[PDB]
Design a protein that fits this description.
The protein is an all-alpha fold. The chain contains five helices and no strands. Bound molecules: the ligand O=C(NNC(=O)N1CCN(C(=O)c2ccco2)CC1)[C@@H]1Cc2ccccc2CN1Cc1ccccc1. It is found in: Nucleus.
Length: 122
């Protein structure tokens, strides 16, 4: 399965599944800076799933590793901002992260395998 480009549509489909998850609600759009007035004191680099989808559609990811780094930033930001581990929004982040990790692993493995096949004789 050595298609170097296949990751992009696989990531579009996984983003569609994440948008169908009720657990993505808080992460779809930027953290509301009016409601959380201290957010940018705590979080240096905001990230959300709409920004990830637009960056993919613009052709501004070169690999699924770069997409994965941005999605993992959504989850680390939630963990850094939460006042407690039993918070609703952080709790949603942990379930959504587990879902994401379960489905991104084959996308990353197939991409890295395809690149190694491309260089097999170099
Ligand atoms: O909620 C939102 N965005 N993000 C945050 O405000 N968050 C709070 C902070 N945070 C944390 O990680 C965290 C950890 C512990 C505590 O917070 C990330 C999440 C946005 C805001 C917004 C503004 C203007 C119009 C619409 C919306 C939609 N909203 C959600 C939504 C999405 C789809 C449908 C219904 C509602």
């Amino acid at each position: 399965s050595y298609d170097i480009q296949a990751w992009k549509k696989q990531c579009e489909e996984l983003l569609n599944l994440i948008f169908q998850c009720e657990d993505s609600e808080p992460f779809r759009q930027p953290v509301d800076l009016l409601e959380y007035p201290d957010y940018r004191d705590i979080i240096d680099t905001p990230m959300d799933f709409a920004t990830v989808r637009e960056t993919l559609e613009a052709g501004n990811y070169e690999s699924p590793m770069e997409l994965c780094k941005d999605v993992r930033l959504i989850f680390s930001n939630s963990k850094a901002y939460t006042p407690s581990k039993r918070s609703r929004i952080y709790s949603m982040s942990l379930r959504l992260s587990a879902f994401f990790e379960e489905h991104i692993s084959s996308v990353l493995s197939d991409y890295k395998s395809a690149l190694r096949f491309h260089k097999r004789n170099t």
